[PDB]
Every structure is written in C-alpha cells, then in structure tokens.
mmCIF file of C-alpha atoms (C1' of nucleotides) and ligand atoms in Angstrom:
data_model
loop_
_atom_site.group_PDB
_atom_site.id
_atom_site.type_symbol
_atom_site.label_atom_id
_atom_site.label_comp_id
_atom_site.label_asym_id
_atom_site.label_seq_id
_atom_site.Cartn_x
_atom_site.Cartn_y
_atom_site.Cartn_z
ATOM 1 C CA UNK I 298 33.227 21.485 -7.439
ATOM 2 C CA UNK I 299 29.888 20.317 -7.090
ATOM 3 C CA UNK I 300 27.471 22.131 -5.085
ATOM 4 C CA UNK I 301 23.440 21.727 -2.955
ATOM 5 C CA UNK I 302 20.248 23.796 -3.757
ATOM 6 C CA UNK I 303 18.374 24.195 -0.858
ATOM 7 C CA UNK I 304 14.332 23.850 -2.029
ATOM 8 C CA UNK I 305 11.797 25.946 -1.160
ATOM 9 C CA UNK I 306 14.598 27.730 0.571
ATOM 10 C CA UNK I 307 12.198 31.328 0.633
ATOM 11 C CA UNK I 308 9.721 29.034 3.477
ATOM 12 C CA UNK I 309 12.642 28.355 5.464
ATOM 13 C CA UNK I 310 14.045 30.986 5.953
ATOM 14 C CA UNK I 311 9.943 32.649 6.861
ATOM 15 C CA UNK I 312 10.089 29.660 9.163
ATOM 16 C CA UNK I 313 14.843 30.261 10.424
ATOM 17 C CA UNK I 314 13.469 34.271 11.057
ATOM 18 C CA UNK I 315 11.245 33.861 13.487
ATOM 19 C CA UNK I 316 13.152 30.174 14.854
ATOM 20 C CA UNK I 317 11.767 27.286 13.833
ATOM 21 C CA UNK I 318 10.455 24.845 16.175
ATOM 22 C CA UNK I 319 10.434 20.517 14.818
ATOM 23 C CA UNK I 320 7.486 18.910 17.196
ATOM 24 C CA UNK I 321 8.955 15.208 18.290
ATOM 25 C CA UNK I 322 7.196 12.133 19.819
ATOM 26 C CA UNK I 323 7.280 8.569 21.028
ATOM 27 C CA UNK I 324 6.032 7.508 17.272
ATOM 28 C CA UNK I 325 7.868 10.098 15.198
ATOM 29 C CA UNK I 326 6.867 12.950 13.558
ATOM 30 C CA UNK I 327 8.327 14.092 10.924
ATOM 31 C CA UNK I 328 10.178 17.887 9.797
ATOM 32 C CA UNK I 329 8.165 20.393 8.648
ATOM 33 C CA UNK I 330 9.283 21.496 5.514
ATOM 34 C CA UNK I 331 10.920 19.158 4.679
ATOM 35 C CA UNK I 332 14.538 19.251 4.044
ATOM 36 C CA UNK I 333 14.820 18.564 -0.129
ATOM 37 C CA UNK I 334 17.939 19.692 -2.101
ATOM 38 C CA UNK I 335 19.105 18.915 -5.724
ATOM 39 C CA UNK I 336 22.445 19.010 -6.678
ATOM 40 C CA UNK I 337 25.096 19.430 -9.283
ATOM 41 C CA UNK I 338 28.648 19.305 -10.319
ATOM 42 C CA UNK I 339 28.924 15.959 -9.420
ATOM 43 C CA UNK I 340 31.064 14.747 -12.039
ATOM 44 C CA UNK I 341 27.962 12.011 -14.879
ATOM 45 C CA UNK I 342 29.286 8.425 -14.741
ATOM 46 C CA UNK I 343 30.513 8.156 -11.356
ATOM 47 C CA UNK I 344 29.195 7.004 -8.340
ATOM 48 C CA UNK I 345 28.105 8.156 -4.642
ATOM 49 C CA UNK I 346 26.181 7.513 -1.751
ATOM 50 C CA UNK I 347 24.319 10.293 -0.150
ATOM 51 C CA UNK I 348 23.427 10.574 3.431
ATOM 52 C CA UNK I 349 21.659 13.068 6.036
ATOM 53 C CA UNK I 350 21.648 13.165 9.833
ATOM 54 C CA UNK I 351 20.923 15.402 12.224
ATOM 55 C CA UNK I 352 23.278 17.075 14.748
ATOM 56 C CA UNK I 353 23.188 19.123 17.762
ATOM 57 C CA UNK I 354 24.098 22.914 17.227
ATOM 58 C CA UNK I 355 25.637 23.590 20.048
ATOM 59 C CA UNK I 356 25.651 22.468 23.572
ATOM 60 C CA UNK I 357 22.884 24.454 25.257
ATOM 61 C CA UNK I 358 19.333 23.727 26.600
ATOM 62 C CA UNK I 359 16.737 26.404 25.665
ATOM 63 C CA UNK I 360 13.512 27.740 27.193
ATOM 64 C CA UNK I 361 11.535 30.785 25.090
ATOM 65 C CA UNK I 362 10.812 33.495 27.634
ATOM 66 C CA UNK I 363 9.718 37.420 26.917
ATOM 67 C CA UNK I 364 8.547 35.487 23.124
ATOM 68 C CA UNK I 365 12.784 34.721 23.276
ATOM 69 C CA UNK I 366 14.013 31.998 22.938
ATOM 70 C CA UNK I 367 17.178 31.895 25.477
ATOM 71 C CA UNK I 368 19.855 29.562 26.620
ATOM 72 C CA UNK I 369 18.806 28.750 29.613
ATOM 73 C CA UNK I 370 21.766 26.194 30.606
ATOM 74 C CA UNK I 371 23.940 23.053 29.347
ATOM 75 C CA UNK I 372 22.342 20.677 27.116
ATOM 76 C CA UNK I 373 21.462 16.822 28.546
ATOM 77 C CA UNK I 374 23.270 14.118 26.667
ATOM 78 C CA UNK I 375 23.223 13.090 23.100
ATOM 79 C CA UNK I 376 22.288 9.543 21.799
ATOM 80 C CA UNK I 377 24.064 8.476 19.004
ATOM 81 C CA UNK I 378 21.852 10.108 15.525
ATOM 82 C CA UNK I 379 20.297 7.473 12.812
ATOM 83 C CA UNK I 380 22.259 8.267 9.747
ATOM 84 C CA UNK I 381 20.143 8.132 6.593
ATOM 85 C CA UNK I 382 21.342 6.570 3.697
ATOM 86 C CA UNK I 383 18.965 7.394 0.984
ATOM 87 C CA UNK I 384 17.808 4.484 -1.085
ATOM 88 C CA UNK I 385 19.640 4.401 -3.838
ATOM 89 C CA UNK I 386 21.968 4.969 -3.223
ATOM 90 C CA UNK I 387 25.105 4.425 -5.004
ATOM 91 C CA UNK I 388 23.829 6.228 -8.096
ATOM 92 C CA UNK I 389 25.670 7.873 -10.712
ATOM 93 C CA UNK I 390 26.271 11.998 -10.640
ATOM 94 C CA UNK I 391 23.763 11.996 -14.005
ATOM 95 C CA UNK I 392 21.166 9.795 -11.807
ATOM 96 C CA UNK I 393 21.437 11.800 -8.667
ATOM 97 C CA UNK I 394 21.189 15.268 -10.693
ATOM 98 C CA UNK I 395 18.285 13.671 -11.610
ATOM 99 C CA UNK I 396 15.446 14.124 -8.754
ATOM 100 C CA UNK I 397 14.996 16.290 -5.671
ATOM 101 C CA UNK I 398 17.057 14.794 -2.785
ATOM 102 C CA UNK I 399 14.119 13.818 0.395
ATOM 103 C CA UNK I 400 14.968 11.369 2.752
ATOM 104 C CA UNK I 401 11.932 10.039 3.219
ATOM 105 C CA UNK I 402 11.892 7.656 6.889
ATOM 106 C CA UNK I 403 13.762 10.198 8.694
ATOM 107 C CA UNK I 404 10.613 10.734 11.706
ATOM 108 C CA UNK I 405 12.309 12.819 15.395
ATOM 109 C CA UNK I 406 11.278 11.213 18.284
ATOM 110 C CA UNK I 407 12.462 11.591 21.882
ATOM 111 C CA UNK I 408 12.597 8.524 22.757
ATOM 112 C CA UNK I 409 15.851 7.709 24.072
ATOM 113 C CA UNK I 410 15.052 4.004 23.860
ATOM 114 C CA UNK I 411 13.328 3.673 20.386
ATOM 115 C CA UNK I 412 14.498 0.717 18.427
ATOM 116 C CA UNK I 413 12.764 2.326 15.245
ATOM 117 C CA UNK I 414 16.127 4.463 14.197
ATOM 118 C CA UNK I 415 14.243 7.674 14.406
ATOM 119 C CA UNK I 416 16.671 10.361 15.090
ATOM 120 C CA UNK I 417 16.309 10.626 19.194
ATOM 121 C CA UNK I 418 16.653 14.252 19.936
ATOM 122 C CA UNK I 419 16.041 16.389 23.338
ATOM 123 C CA UNK I 420 13.087 18.991 23.641
ATOM 124 C CA UNK I 421 14.372 21.855 23.578
ATOM 125 C CA UNK I 422 17.766 21.781 22.627
ATOM 126 C CA UNK I 423 19.261 23.587 18.954
ATOM 127 C CA UNK I 424 19.869 21.400 16.280
ATOM 128 C CA UNK I 425 21.169 21.576 12.573
ATOM 129 C CA UNK I 426 20.086 19.008 9.587
ATOM 130 C CA UNK I 427 23.435 17.947 7.530
ATOM 131 C CA UNK I 428 23.222 16.453 4.167
ATOM 132 C CA UNK I 429 26.757 14.568 2.811
ATOM 133 C CA UNK I 430 27.485 13.523 0.105
ATOM 134 C CA UNK I 431 30.387 10.539 -0.402
ATOM 135 C CA UNK I 432 31.946 9.558 -4.010
ATOM 136 C CA UNK I 433 32.012 5.383 -3.608
ATOM 137 C CA UNK I 434 29.707 3.220 -4.995
ATOM 138 C CA UNK I 435 29.912 0.550 -1.889
ATOM 139 C CA UNK I 436 28.163 0.868 1.029
ATOM 140 C CA UNK I 437 30.356 -1.091 3.419
ATOM 141 C CA UNK I 438 33.103 1.898 2.454
ATOM 142 C CA UNK I 439 31.660 5.082 3.693
ATOM 143 C CA UNK I 440 33.583 3.770 6.880
ATOM 144 C CA UNK I 441 36.546 4.366 5.592
ATOM 145 C CA UNK I 442 35.134 7.381 3.428
ATOM 146 C CA UNK I 443 35.645 11.017 3.543
ATOM 147 C CA UNK I 444 31.988 12.710 3.745
ATOM 148 C CA UNK I 445 32.145 15.901 1.714
ATOM 149 C CA UNK I 446 29.097 17.945 4.387
ATOM 150 C CA UNK I 447 26.498 19.735 3.087
ATOM 151 C CA UNK I 448 25.387 22.490 6.293
ATOM 152 C CA UNK I 449 22.489 25.337 5.829
ATOM 153 C CA UNK I 450 21.871 27.002 8.752
ATOM 154 C CA UNK I 451 18.340 28.701 7.986
ATOM 155 C CA UNK I 452 17.102 24.513 8.644
ATOM 156 C CA UNK I 453 18.057 24.721 12.045
ATOM 157 C CA UNK I 454 15.688 24.285 14.095
ATOM 158 C CA UNK I 455 14.583 24.294 18.324
ATOM 159 C CA UNK I 456 12.974 20.386 18.769
ATOM 160 C CA UNK I 457 9.589 20.783 21.136
ATOM 161 C CA UNK I 458 6.321 18.321 22.263
ATOM 162 C CA UNK I 459 4.680 21.322 21.620
ATOM 163 C CA UNK I 460 4.939 24.393 19.753
ATOM 164 C CA UNK I 461 5.310 28.080 21.361
ATOM 165 C CA UNK I 462 5.953 30.824 19.599
ATOM 166 C CA UNK I 463 2.174 30.362 18.476
ATOM 167 C CA UNK I 464 3.579 32.843 15.325
ATOM 168 C CA UNK I 465 5.389 28.572 13.961
ATOM 169 C CA UNK I 466 2.109 26.898 14.515
ATOM 170 C CA UNK I 467 0.733 29.795 11.877
ATOM 171 C CA UNK I 468 3.476 29.232 9.893
ATOM 172 C CA UNK I 469 2.712 25.157 10.307
ATOM 173 C CA UNK I 470 -1.029 25.789 9.322
ATOM 174 C CA UNK I 471 -1.229 28.103 6.664
ATOM 175 C CA UNK I 472 2.216 26.172 5.311
ATOM 176 C CA UNK I 473 1.349 22.351 5.654
ATOM 177 C CA UNK I 474 -1.354 20.566 3.538
ATOM 178 C CA UNK I 475 -2.514 18.656 6.538
ATOM 179 C CA UNK I 476 -2.288 21.232 8.742
ATOM 180 C CA UNK I 477 -5.714 23.077 6.750
ATOM 181 C CA UNK I 478 -7.998 22.807 8.272
ATOM 182 C CA UNK I 479 -6.939 24.931 11.002
ATOM 183 C CA UNK I 480 -6.733 27.502 8.149
ATOM 184 C CA UNK I 481 -8.946 30.578 8.731
ATOM 185 C CA UNK U 156 26.693 -22.334 6.762
ATOM 186 C CA UNK U 157 23.075 -22.028 6.731
ATOM 187 C CA UNK U 158 20.056 -23.799 6.213
ATOM 188 C CA UNK U 159 16.888 -22.026 5.668
ATOM 189 C CA UNK U 160 12.834 -22.824 5.440
ATOM 190 C CA UNK U 161 10.373 -20.133 3.800
ATOM 191 C CA UNK U 162 7.517 -20.881 5.652
ATOM 192 C CA UNK U 163 4.669 -19.067 3.161
ATOM 193 C CA UNK U 164 1.896 -16.198 5.633
ATOM 194 C CA UNK U 165 -1.797 -16.947 4.926
ATOM 195 C CA UNK U 166 -1.641 -19.937 2.728
ATOM 196 C CA UNK U 167 -4.644 -21.071 4.334
ATOM 197 C CA UNK U 168 -6.237 -17.907 1.937
ATOM 198 C CA UNK U 169 -4.065 -18.962 -0.497
ATOM 199 C CA UNK U 170 -5.066 -22.232 -1.393
ATOM 200 C CA UNK U 171 -8.494 -20.827 -0.907
ATOM 201 C CA UNK U 172 -8.406 -18.623 -3.653
ATOM 202 C CA UNK U 173 -5.851 -21.673 -5.564
ATOM 203 C CA UNK U 174 -8.788 -23.391 -5.849
ATOM 204 C CA UNK U 175 -11.292 -21.481 -7.533
ATOM 205 C CA UNK U 176 -8.220 -20.555 -9.373
ATOM 206 C CA UNK U 177 -6.402 -17.167 -8.442
ATOM 207 C CA UNK U 178 -6.919 -14.099 -10.793
ATOM 208 C CA UNK U 179 -4.722 -10.665 -9.995
ATOM 209 C CA UNK U 180 -5.751 -7.342 -11.559
ATOM 210 C CA UNK U 181 -3.242 -5.852 -13.360
ATOM 211 C CA UNK U 182 -3.568 -2.176 -14.345
ATOM 212 C CA UNK U 183 -1.091 0.837 -15.497
ATOM 213 C CA UNK U 184 -0.960 2.319 -12.737
ATOM 214 C CA UNK U 185 -0.088 -0.482 -11.019
ATOM 215 C CA UNK U 186 -2.367 -3.195 -8.413
ATOM 216 C CA UNK U 187 -1.223 -4.581 -6.005
ATOM 217 C CA UNK U 188 -1.419 -8.103 -5.461
ATOM 218 C CA UNK U 189 -4.120 -9.737 -3.573
ATOM 219 C CA UNK U 190 -3.320 -11.805 -1.192
ATOM 220 C CA UNK U 191 0.065 -9.802 -0.282
ATOM 221 C CA UNK U 192 2.838 -12.992 -0.637
ATOM 222 C CA UNK U 193 4.357 -12.999 2.649
ATOM 223 C CA UNK U 194 7.017 -14.916 4.467
ATOM 224 C CA UNK U 195 8.414 -15.809 7.538
ATOM 225 C CA UNK U 196 12.180 -17.255 7.567
ATOM 226 C CA UNK U 197 13.715 -19.501 9.718
ATOM 227 C CA UNK U 198 17.423 -20.874 9.547
ATOM 228 C CA UNK U 199 19.522 -18.831 8.682
ATOM 229 C CA UNK U 200 22.416 -17.315 9.988
ATOM 230 C CA UNK U 201 21.816 -15.063 12.825
ATOM 231 C CA UNK U 202 25.382 -12.672 11.498
ATOM 232 C CA UNK U 203 25.555 -12.778 8.451
ATOM 233 C CA UNK U 204 24.015 -10.203 6.145
ATOM 234 C CA UNK U 205 21.266 -11.524 2.954
ATOM 235 C CA UNK U 206 19.640 -9.188 0.406
ATOM 236 C CA UNK U 207 16.045 -10.574 0.561
ATOM 237 C CA UNK U 208 14.441 -10.739 -3.249
ATOM 238 C CA UNK U 209 10.411 -11.432 -5.038
ATOM 239 C CA UNK U 210 9.788 -11.576 -8.863
ATOM 240 C CA UNK U 211 7.499 -13.294 -11.255
ATOM 241 C CA UNK U 212 7.316 -15.895 -13.600
ATOM 242 C CA UNK U 213 6.410 -17.285 -16.533
ATOM 243 C CA UNK U 214 4.272 -19.579 -14.851
ATOM 244 C CA UNK U 215 4.085 -21.912 -18.179
ATOM 245 C CA UNK U 216 4.373 -20.754 -22.055
ATOM 246 C CA UNK U 217 -0.438 -19.937 -23.050
ATOM 247 C CA UNK U 218 -2.003 -18.191 -23.431
ATOM 248 C CA UNK U 219 -5.649 -18.428 -21.680
ATOM 249 C CA UNK U 220 -9.620 -17.620 -22.250
ATOM 250 C CA UNK U 221 -12.753 -18.259 -19.094
ATOM 251 C CA UNK U 222 -15.292 -19.978 -20.831
ATOM 252 C CA UNK U 223 -17.767 -21.976 -19.174
ATOM 253 C CA UNK U 224 -16.654 -21.269 -16.441
ATOM 254 C CA UNK U 225 -13.949 -22.722 -16.193
ATOM 255 C CA UNK U 226 -9.524 -21.447 -18.086
ATOM 256 C CA UNK U 227 -8.497 -22.759 -21.014
ATOM 257 C CA UNK U 228 -5.065 -23.486 -22.620
ATOM 258 C CA UNK U 229 -6.464 -20.745 -25.847
ATOM 259 C CA UNK U 230 -2.741 -20.742 -27.494
ATOM 260 C CA UNK U 231 0.865 -19.884 -27.535
ATOM 261 C CA UNK U 232 1.299 -17.566 -25.348
ATOM 262 C CA UNK U 233 2.953 -13.425 -25.908
ATOM 263 C CA UNK U 234 6.305 -12.434 -25.570
ATOM 264 C CA UNK U 235 7.735 -11.553 -21.566
ATOM 265 C CA UNK U 236 9.217 -8.466 -20.698
ATOM 266 C CA UNK U 237 11.995 -8.885 -18.749
ATOM 267 C CA UNK U 238 10.752 -9.240 -14.728
ATOM 268 C CA UNK U 239 11.357 -5.858 -11.830
ATOM 269 C CA UNK U 240 13.499 -8.169 -9.075
ATOM 270 C CA UNK U 241 12.699 -6.827 -6.086
ATOM 271 C CA UNK U 242 14.847 -6.884 -3.788
ATOM 272 C CA UNK U 243 13.534 -6.006 0.075
ATOM 273 C CA UNK U 244 13.725 -1.879 1.634
ATOM 274 C CA UNK U 245 14.784 -3.403 4.300
ATOM 275 C CA UNK U 246 17.583 -5.416 2.532
ATOM 276 C CA UNK U 247 20.430 -5.739 3.061
ATOM 277 C CA UNK U 248 19.788 -6.866 6.766
ATOM 278 C CA UNK U 249 22.164 -9.614 9.019
ATOM 279 C CA UNK U 250 19.970 -13.227 9.414
ATOM 280 C CA UNK U 251 18.720 -12.098 12.916
ATOM 281 C CA UNK U 252 17.048 -8.677 11.437
ATOM 282 C CA UNK U 253 14.832 -11.086 9.047
ATOM 283 C CA UNK U 254 14.185 -13.602 10.824
ATOM 284 C CA UNK U 255 12.539 -11.689 13.550
ATOM 285 C CA UNK U 256 9.925 -10.451 10.982
ATOM 286 C CA UNK U 257 7.620 -11.060 8.823
ATOM 287 C CA UNK U 258 8.693 -10.178 5.254
ATOM 288 C CA UNK U 259 6.289 -9.387 3.399
ATOM 289 C CA UNK U 260 6.915 -7.926 0.037
ATOM 290 C CA UNK U 261 2.738 -6.772 -0.503
ATOM 291 C CA UNK U 262 3.748 -2.877 -1.982
ATOM 292 C CA UNK U 263 5.219 -4.777 -5.329
ATOM 293 C CA UNK U 264 3.408 -2.975 -8.322
ATOM 294 C CA UNK U 265 1.885 -5.216 -11.438
ATOM 295 C CA UNK U 266 1.336 -3.552 -14.580
ATOM 296 C CA UNK U 267 0.081 -4.216 -17.981
ATOM 297 C CA UNK U 268 1.496 -0.801 -19.039
ATOM 298 C CA UNK U 269 5.318 -2.868 -20.296
ATOM 299 C CA UNK U 270 6.654 1.267 -21.393
ATOM 300 C CA UNK U 271 5.847 1.661 -17.770
ATOM 301 C CA UNK U 272 10.014 3.107 -16.176
ATOM 302 C CA UNK U 273 8.710 2.762 -12.375
ATOM 303 C CA UNK U 274 10.097 -0.969 -11.311
ATOM 304 C CA UNK U 275 6.752 -2.005 -11.521
ATOM 305 C CA UNK U 276 6.184 -5.505 -12.533
ATOM 306 C CA UNK U 277 5.380 -5.624 -16.261
ATOM 307 C CA UNK U 278 2.574 -8.918 -16.610
ATOM 308 C CA UNK U 279 0.730 -9.765 -20.054
ATOM 309 C CA UNK U 280 -3.013 -9.445 -19.074
ATOM 310 C CA UNK U 281 -4.557 -13.321 -19.659
ATOM 311 C CA UNK U 282 -1.314 -15.140 -19.139
ATOM 312 C CA UNK U 283 -0.058 -17.416 -15.983
ATOM 313 C CA UNK U 284 2.853 -16.855 -13.694
ATOM 314 C CA UNK U 285 4.142 -17.692 -10.598
ATOM 315 C CA UNK U 286 6.157 -15.587 -7.409
ATOM 316 C CA UNK U 287 9.295 -16.196 -6.690
ATOM 317 C CA UNK U 288 11.027 -15.338 -3.387
ATOM 318 C CA UNK U 289 14.539 -15.832 -3.906
ATOM 319 C CA UNK U 290 17.913 -15.489 -0.156
ATOM 320 C CA UNK U 291 21.120 -14.625 -1.146
ATOM 321 C CA UNK U 292 24.041 -14.709 0.955
ATOM 322 C CA UNK U 293 25.418 -11.519 0.262
ATOM 323 C CA UNK U 294 26.122 -8.104 2.238
ATOM 324 C CA UNK U 295 26.167 -5.532 -0.724
ATOM 325 C CA UNK U 296 23.051 -4.771 -3.744
ATOM 326 C CA UNK U 297 25.577 -4.736 -6.392
ATOM 327 C CA UNK U 298 27.069 -8.159 -5.896
ATOM 328 C CA UNK U 299 24.046 -10.045 -6.739
ATOM 329 C CA UNK U 300 24.391 -10.640 -10.275
ATOM 330 C CA UNK U 301 27.285 -12.439 -9.704
ATOM 331 C CA UNK U 302 26.056 -13.910 -6.151
ATOM 332 C CA UNK U 303 23.775 -17.274 -6.134
ATOM 333 C CA UNK U 304 20.191 -17.194 -5.076
ATOM 334 C CA UNK U 305 18.954 -20.087 -3.924
ATOM 335 C CA UNK U 306 14.754 -19.221 -4.882
ATOM 336 C CA UNK U 307 11.195 -20.779 -3.418
ATOM 337 C CA UNK U 308 8.649 -22.306 -5.197
ATOM 338 C CA UNK U 309 5.145 -21.732 -4.297
ATOM 339 C CA UNK U 310 3.023 -23.317 -6.568
ATOM 340 C CA UNK U 311 -0.696 -22.818 -4.867
ATOM 341 C CA UNK U 312 0.347 -18.643 -4.899
ATOM 342 C CA UNK U 313 0.512 -19.394 -9.194
ATOM 343 C CA UNK U 314 -2.372 -16.822 -10.591
ATOM 344 C CA UNK U 315 -3.517 -15.530 -13.979
ATOM 345 C CA UNK U 316 -3.200 -11.704 -14.702
ATOM 346 C CA UNK U 317 -6.195 -9.679 -16.264
ATOM 347 C CA UNK U 318 -8.135 -6.149 -15.938
ATOM 348 C CA UNK U 319 -10.822 -7.435 -15.091
ATOM 349 C CA UNK U 320 -12.255 -10.348 -12.348
ATOM 350 C CA UNK U 321 -13.490 -13.286 -14.909
ATOM 351 C CA UNK U 322 -14.264 -15.715 -12.067
ATOM 352 C CA UNK U 323 -17.026 -14.304 -9.837
ATOM 353 C CA UNK U 324 -16.185 -16.578 -7.001
ATOM 354 C CA UNK U 325 -13.011 -14.549 -7.186
ATOM 355 C CA UNK U 326 -14.012 -11.139 -6.859
ATOM 356 C CA UNK U 327 -15.935 -12.672 -4.426
ATOM 357 C CA UNK U 328 -12.821 -13.394 -2.009
ATOM 358 C CA UNK U 329 -11.004 -11.274 -3.045
ATOM 359 C CA UNK U 330 -14.016 -8.141 -1.079
ATOM 360 C CA UNK U 331 -14.251 -10.490 2.194
ATOM 361 C CA UNK U 332 -11.015 -10.531 2.245
ATOM 362 C CA UNK U 333 -8.941 -7.847 1.448
ATOM 363 C CA UNK U 334 -9.609 -4.924 4.008
ATOM 364 C CA UNK U 335 -9.173 -1.930 1.305
ATOM 365 C CA UNK U 336 -12.345 -3.460 -0.867
ATOM 366 C CA UNK U 337 -14.457 -3.780 2.629
ATOM 367 C CA UNK U 338 -16.969 -1.278 0.781
ATOM 368 C CA UNK U 339 -18.403 -4.578 -1.179
ATOM 369 C CA UNK U 340 -19.518 -6.714 1.595
ATOM 370 C CA UNK U 341 -22.394 -7.904 2.044
ATOM 371 C "C1'" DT T 1 7.229 23.999 41.044
ATOM 372 C "C1'" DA T 2 5.393 25.665 37.403
ATOM 373 C "C1'" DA T 3 6.730 24.158 32.939
ATOM 374 C "C1'" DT T 4 6.500 19.972 29.601
ATOM 375 C "C1'" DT T 5 4.371 16.422 27.854
ATOM 376 C "C1'" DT T 6 0.702 12.445 26.673
ATOM 377 C "C1'" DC T 7 -3.394 11.549 24.810
ATOM 378 C "C1'" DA T 8 -7.266 10.878 22.821
ATOM 379 C "C1'" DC T 9 -9.961 13.860 18.738
ATOM 380 C "C1'" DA T 10 -11.671 15.388 13.992
ATOM 381 C "C1'" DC T 11 -9.873 17.114 10.484
ATOM 382 C "C1'" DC T 12 -6.559 16.378 6.432
ATOM 383 C "C1'" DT T 13 -3.803 14.493 2.153
ATOM 384 C "C1'" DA T 14 -2.285 10.178 -0.190
ATOM 385 C "C1'" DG T 15 -3.929 6.185 -1.856
ATOM 386 C "C1'" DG T 16 -6.059 1.346 -2.254
ATOM 387 C "C1'" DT T 17 -11.504 -1.118 -3.526
ATOM 388 C "C1'" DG T 18 -14.390 -3.378 -7.222
ATOM 389 C "C1'" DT T 19 -17.988 -1.372 -10.164
ATOM 390 C "C1'" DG T 20 -20.921 -0.101 -13.672
ATOM 391 C "C1'" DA T 21 -20.480 0.352 -18.833
ATOM 392 C "C1'" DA T 22 -17.855 3.551 -22.624
ATOM 393 C "C1'" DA T 23 -13.935 2.691 -25.681
ATOM 394 C "C1'" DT T 24 -11.232 0.190 -27.944
ATOM 395 C "C1'" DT Y 161 -15.585 -8.868 -34.142
ATOM 396 C "C1'" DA Y 162 -17.078 -9.601 -29.059
ATOM 397 C "C1'" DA Y 163 -14.357 -9.888 -25.418
ATOM 398 C "C1'" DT Y 164 -10.864 -7.339 -23.420
ATOM 399 C "C1'" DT Y 165 -9.385 -2.812 -21.642
ATOM 400 C "C1'" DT Y 166 -10.300 1.914 -19.596
ATOM 401 C "C1'" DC Y 167 -11.434 5.737 -15.951
ATOM 402 C "C1'" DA Y 168 -14.686 8.677 -12.037
ATOM 403 C "C1'" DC Y 169 -16.691 6.947 -8.557
ATOM 404 C "C1'" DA Y 170 -18.176 6.004 -3.082
ATOM 405 C "C1'" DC Y 171 -16.165 3.409 -0.213
ATOM 406 C "C1'" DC Y 172 -12.130 1.623 1.976
ATOM 407 C "C1'" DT Y 173 -6.861 2.611 5.016
ATOM 408 C "C1'" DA Y 174 -2.946 4.158 6.200
ATOM 409 C "C1'" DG Y 175 -0.922 7.971 8.298
ATOM 410 C "C1'" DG Y 176 0.304 12.625 9.019
ATOM 411 C "C1'" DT Y 177 -2.099 17.768 10.993
ATOM 412 C "C1'" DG Y 178 -2.219 21.168 15.412
ATOM 413 C "C1'" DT Y 179 -6.430 21.353 20.265
ATOM 414 C "C1'" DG Y 180 -6.437 22.277 24.289
ATOM 415 C "C1'" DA Y 181 -7.102 19.674 28.975
ATOM 416 C "C1'" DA Y 182 -5.455 16.217 31.354
ATOM 417 C "C1'" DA Y 183 -0.798 14.408 34.016
ATOM 418 C "C1'" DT Y 184 4.281 15.153 35.127
HETATM 419 MG MG1 MG M 657 12.596 28.936 -5.779
#
DNA sequence: TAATTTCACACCTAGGTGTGAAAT
DNA sequence: TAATTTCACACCTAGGTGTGAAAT
C-alpha cells in the first residue's frame, strides 16, 4: 500500500497547535512552511502522476477575537482551485520515491481575477492542502483516472492578509530564513 | 494545419556578438548562455497543443584554437556527448498561449562535466555549436520520440564553447549588455 | 463602522557575472 | 609543455520576509 509521509512534521505541529495562518497577497505569497512529502510503497516500475491542490476546509468565514479563531458566519463563494501537476510527472514509482516531493510553483493570492494560475483563496477562510497520487502515464488521462487523495489535517490553515495571532508571526520569524532579519 | 514563423528576438545583439565570433563560457556547475536564446512564434494553430524545445548540436567536427587574434581550425573534434533536449517548461500548451509571449530558454545551462546529472547541456571546450529551436504539434510529452520535429536554425547564434573568454572584444560585449555583469562596466 | 487590505521599506536567501591568479 | 581549467571573491539581479502607517 503506497504511503505518504509529511516532511518537517514537528514544525507543522507547532504551527497547527497555535492555529496556522498563511498570508495571501495580490501578487502571490509562498506557503510557509512549504508542503513537502515523501512517498513509499509505490510499485517501482509503474508510472504515476503526483499532484496537489488546496481546498476549503469547511464553508465558514472566520474572525480572530479574544485571542481565538471563531466561525463568524457562512463562507464567501470559492474559486476553482489550481491543481498542480508536479513537473516530473509522469515518473516511475522508483523515481518518485528517491526525492522529497514539493510544489515549487505554488503561490497563494486573494485576487479572484488572477491569471497567473495562482491558488486563489478568500481571506479569513479555512483551507486544507491535499496531495494526490494517480497511477497513469498520460496527463490527459487525469480526467478519467481515480485520484488517491492524502489528507494531513496538521497542514490546515486560515488564509489572512495580515497575521492575527502574534505567536504565529513569531514562529514564522524564527523558522523561515527569509524572515530572520526580524529575529531577536 | 499551421504555417509557423519563428522570429529570433534581440537579433541586433546576436549580430554584434556574431561579427566578433561568439564565445560561451561553460563550467562544471552550469553556465547560462548570454545572450539567452529567445524567440517569438506566429502562425501556430490557436487551439492545437504544441510542445516547444531546444537543443545545441555540434556545428561541425572541428576543434578550434584562438591565435593571433583569430579563431582557426586546429584539428578534428573530440567525441561529443548526447545533448539535453530541453522541453520548454510551459509545455505542453496551446498555440495561442505560445504566440502570446516570448519563448525563452534563458535557464538552459552549459557544462563541461561529461558526468553531469542535472540535465545540463554538455559541451567540449574549444568546439563550435549551433542552438536549435523545435516545434512539435503534439499534446503529450511521451509521444516525442515518435513525433515529427520542425527544426529552426539561426546561424547568427552559433558560438564556440570556452572555459574562459579568449577575445576581449567578446568579454566587453558581455559586460556591457548582461545586467549581471554590470559591476564591471566602465 | 471598525476591521481588513495595501504598500513602500530594509533585510534576508539564492544565485548570475567576470576577475585574477593558482592548479592542472 | 604553454595553454586551459578552476575557484573565492566583490558586485550584481531576482525574489521572499514581516513591518506598521495608510487606505478602505
Ligand atoms: Mg524527522
């Protein structure tokens, strides 16, 4: 049975315990931590296509009040979510199992008319990253193939235009090399 | 049915290098070409899917030497390695998509490491090379070994690979035109 | 309306330049 | 052999960070 392992799980757990937030911007923001995985148990010679997308975790809009995230009401409408085909697809099980799998092109935006293929999200809504394995050797075969979808609830997050919980901001500062200029 | 037209971008700059005898530095870690090979396509079927590619092949079977300020054939070429065929990352894509932007392979890299495992283009120093652009009307990467390639040659992009510039006039053009080298501008 | 969104900044990482001289 | 290949370096490009004041 193919199995998927989340990389840097201890760090995802630290963020998740405090309520993960991801900033979104018109021009596109990277996710931090990045969503990275390792696959095992794939048939070595069979061909697979690896993909990832982000979907709404529920149909609620949230607000951060009294130091907590709470559902404020029903969610705004959602845009179709970019499905990313990993650039090495299709590749053999062997090939996929010898590398950490990540999606470098992924970026989050709040611009609903974005034309860059970014993942479009509603600020103050909750999202769940999903990883997919499809046993097929033709990208065009994707609309007729079964997707095995791997969910890691510890990577769930609320999208925001600016951080709400300072404890999340501190973890981002202390762990993302690009933000080290703000470290004490 | 289409009627492709391939236009070389920044030809004026390519001509300036070509008139002096273009050289491209190659390194173990991989070196970008400058000028980068960029083109614009017209005449594609707007809806059809195309795969666009590029590779660099030997321009002849000679080894060169730069002496008395001139490039001259020194003898027969050394054996060559297979050459990374670059599939443009945006591939596959519709004809309309392709015609809506300059097609650049500025990320392709040149190396002298015959054991390279990065997919870089492997060249022999002091040998002459010709970049090639290819258009494939096919909607899947796996059908390339069997698909028909239309190949476009631009002789003005021919260059000799080196590990260090030989002709100081070429070094000056690289300095004066490549933003990454502007620190060396007068 | 209060909250949320935007933007110019000063840093940060990653990595593309030819140089000058050592190493082959 | 004498020329070619290598590499740390200063100086660059390119883009990823949160900040906090302004705008909505
Ligand atoms: Mg571990």
